[PDB]
Structures are given as structure tokens and as C-alpha cells.
Amino acid sequence: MPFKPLVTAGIESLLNTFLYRSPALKTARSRLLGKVLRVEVKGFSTSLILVFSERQVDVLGEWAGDADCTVIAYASVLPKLRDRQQLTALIRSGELEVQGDIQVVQNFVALADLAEFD
Amino acid sequence: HHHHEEMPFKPLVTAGIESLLNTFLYRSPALKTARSRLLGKVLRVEVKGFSTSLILVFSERQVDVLGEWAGDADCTVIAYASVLPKLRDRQQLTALIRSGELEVQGDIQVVQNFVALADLAEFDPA
Numbered sequence: 001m002p003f004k005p006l007v008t009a010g011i012e013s014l015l016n017t018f019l020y021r022s023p024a025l026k027t028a029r030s031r032l033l034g035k036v037l038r039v040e041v042k043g044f045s046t047s048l049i050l051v052f053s054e055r056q057v058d059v060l061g062e063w064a065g066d067a068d069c070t071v072i073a074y075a076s077v078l079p080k081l082r083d084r085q086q087l088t089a090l091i092r093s094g095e096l097e098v099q100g101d102i103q104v105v106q107n108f109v110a111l112a113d114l115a116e117f118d
Numbered sequence: 119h120h121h122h123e124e125m126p127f128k129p130l131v132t133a134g135i136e137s138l139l140n141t142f143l144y145r146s147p148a149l150k151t152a153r154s155r156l157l158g159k160v161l162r163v164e165v166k167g168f169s170t171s172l173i174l175v176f177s178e179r180q181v182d183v184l185g186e187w188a189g190d191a192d193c194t195v196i197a198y199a200s201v202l203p204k205l206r207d208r209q210q211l212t213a214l215i216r217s218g219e220l221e222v223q224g225d226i227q228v229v230q231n232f233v234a235l236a237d238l239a240e241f242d243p244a
């Protein structure tokens with residue numbers, strides 16, 4: 001199946017430098033341990049699968065299995081997922097569609113928010 | 119890089135796009151003649167819904183990606199990210215420009231040459 005290896009490797013390195021380089025974020029990352037988040041970017045044919053472990057997040061373009069959480073949005077909603085206080089508004093407006101366990105995306109957005117200085 | 123210090127998201131996005139474009143377009147010497155058409159060109163990409171631009175600077179051994187450019191761009195493209203999977207060939211490029219899904223300012227030949235390069239990068243199995 002099309003794994004899109006160059007794009008997924010690039011997204012993986014980006015997410016690992018941003019979220020996993022700092023050991024100060026360890027306890028915030030512990031909330032996502034063993035979780036599988038499926039990201040469907042509207043207009044794109046392939047899904048992105050994020051598998052969280054202690055050392056890093058692995059990204060795949062193809063997954064045989066279930067995701068704990070699935071998020072559907074247009075590309076312009078992705079930069080908005082670095083703010084915990086605006087996730088409820090995005091979900092309410094339908095800009096971000098959530099299937100499965102909403103806690104997985106809430107925990108991810110809380111992590112990304114703590115990863116970056118405003 | 120090798121450090122514990124928190125670094126901004128924007129330079130990580132441009133570094134990531136740069137790495138991607140160089141592996142995809144610049145690794146294969148078979149694409150040399152297609153790359154020659156973009157030498158010295160500056161392509162500004164404004165992704166609708168995003169606040170910041172992407173600047174692509176084509177040289178012989180690589181394309182550099184920046185988040186800012188005080189100078190002159192040879193071509194400026196404005197589109198939503200969902201048009202990227204739609205610009206496979208030059209036939210589709212004309213339809214996207216005709217429909218206004220892709221807005222072009224400056225030299226249209228730069229984006230035609232870029233799309234023609236990406237299309238040949240897919241044909242070339244390297």
C-alpha cells in the first residue's frame with residue numbers, strides 16, 4: 001500500500017524535534033503513551049498515523065489496525081492545534097471533526113501548547 | 119539538532135520542507151535538465167489560511183526554503199494546500215489557473231517548470 005515514505009519521515013522528524021527533544025515535556029508526553037492518532041487532512045488522499053511511545057512518535061502513511069482517535073480537518077486547522085484553549089471552539093464550529101477518544105487529541109494539543117513559547 | 123532547548127515551529131516546517139524537496143527533486147542526476155529551467159529562480163508560495171509565506175530559491179545543487187524574503191520573487195503562487203495533490207501534470211496546472219484555484223503573479227513559466235520537474239521526479243524511479 002502507498003506508505004508515502006518521504007512525507008511521513010519528514011512529518012516524523014518535525015514532530016520529534018518539536019515534541020520529543022526536550023526532557024522537560026516527559027510527564028506531558030506520558031499521557032499519550034501507547035496511543036494511536038489518525039489524522040485525515042481533507043483534500044489529501046492519504047491518512048497520517050501517529051504512534052506515541054516513550055522515546056518518540058512514529059508516523060505511518062498506512063496502518064492495519066484501529067486508531068484510539070481520528071481527527072478530520074483542512075490543512076489550515078493544523079497550525080491551530082498548538083493552543084489548548086481554542087480546541088473546543090474548532091470542534092464546536094466543525095473545523096475539526098473528532099471520532100473515538102477525544103482525550104487523545106486534547107492531550108496532544110496540550111503537549112504541543114507546552115512545547116512552544118507563545 | 120543535538121540539544122534540549124525548545125525551538126520555534128516555523129523554522130522546523132521550512133527545514134522539513136527543504137529536506138523533502140531536496141530528496142525528491144535534487145537527489146537524481148537524471149533530472150538535471152529539468153532543474154536547469156529553475157536555476158536562480160525565486161518562487162513565493164502563499165498558502166491560504168496560513169499567516170506565513172514559503173520562499174523557494176533554486177540553485178544547481180539544491181533548493182533552499184525560507185520563511186521570509188525582503189527581495190523580489192520571480193513568481194508568486196496563492197492557493198489552498200489541497201491543490202498540491204491536484205498539480206500532478208501541466209494539463210491540470212492550466213485548469214487550476216483557469217479556475218482560479220491557483221493564483222499566479224509574475225512569471226508563470228517558473229510554476230510551469232516546477233510542476234513539470236515534480237512530474238518528471240515521479241517518472242524517474244530514482
Ligand SMILES: [Ca+2]
Nearest residue numbers: 113114116118
Ligand atoms: Ca504554547
Ligand SMILES: [Ca+2]
Nearest residue numbers: 136181182183
Ligand atoms: Ca537552507
Ligand SMILES: [Ca+2]
Nearest residue numbers: 190191192224
Ligand atoms: Ca520580479
Ligand SMILES: [Ca+2]
Nearest residue numbers: 158159160192
Ligand atoms: Ca530573480
Ligand SMILES: [Ca+2]
Nearest residue numbers: 206207237240
Ligand atoms: Ca505526476
Ligand SMILES: [Ca+2]
Nearest residue numbers: 239242243244
Ligand atoms: Ca524519483
Ligand SMILES: [Tb+3]
Nearest residue numbers: 001062063064
Ligand atoms: Tb490501508
Ligand SMILES: [Tb+3]
Nearest residue numbers: 164169170171
Ligand atoms: Tb502575503
